[PDB]
Amino acid sequence: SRDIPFGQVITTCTTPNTVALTFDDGPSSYTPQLLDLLSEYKVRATFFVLGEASQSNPQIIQRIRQEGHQVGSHTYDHTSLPTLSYDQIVQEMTSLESVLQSTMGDIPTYMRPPYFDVNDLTLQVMSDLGYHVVTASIDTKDYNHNSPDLISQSYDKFVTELNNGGNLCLAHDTKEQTVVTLAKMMLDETKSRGLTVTTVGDCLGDPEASWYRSSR
Ligand SMILES: [Cl-]
Ligand SMILES: [Zn+2]
């Protein structure tokens, strides 16, 4: 199977006719409802999770994994990594590894940088630690439309960027309107198109055995 680069920004799925719906900054109190919706549609998603959220909601981390979704790293503290030293960037990653090792029994090989901010130093750390670096090719901007009257604008951006060939989509399951309204709109549209709605690792051709590794 494919070799997938480490320490190099990945924006787009490679498996034809796939789409990866992804959710950042959780788990949150809305994540369980989103998991219910994903199971109704029989799809898989990817969750790039944070430190305090994972420590507060370990049972949601376990439920994400048991229902076949992928857990990726979003750093512990959500710091813009180019504002940090090499050692500090390492610590942002390994501190979340301690949390995830204890909650889900392994650690991710996929990460998403806060705000998509990268520089050479950040990419060097991710290469050295063995992380695939994922940003996005669809960005819902749902954080800025988190109200019933605004959330349709995130769907319009989603559809337009999907039509432009985007296939790796950023939303936040910390936002109520993303879970209660936008996710169903995205899932209906991807179902209508007959897309394979799957994890980031799967949409890159990576077997699930490679989305995680044992403790360092
Ligand atoms: Cl440094
Ligand atoms: Zn984030």
Coordinates of C-alpha atoms and ligand atoms in Angstrom, one line a residue, residues 85-87 121, ligand 1:
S85 CA 10.3 26.5 19.8
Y86 CA 11.2 23.1 18.5
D87 CA 11.0 21.7 22.1
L121 CA 10.3 24.3 12.3
Ligands
CL1 CL 14.1 26.2 18.3

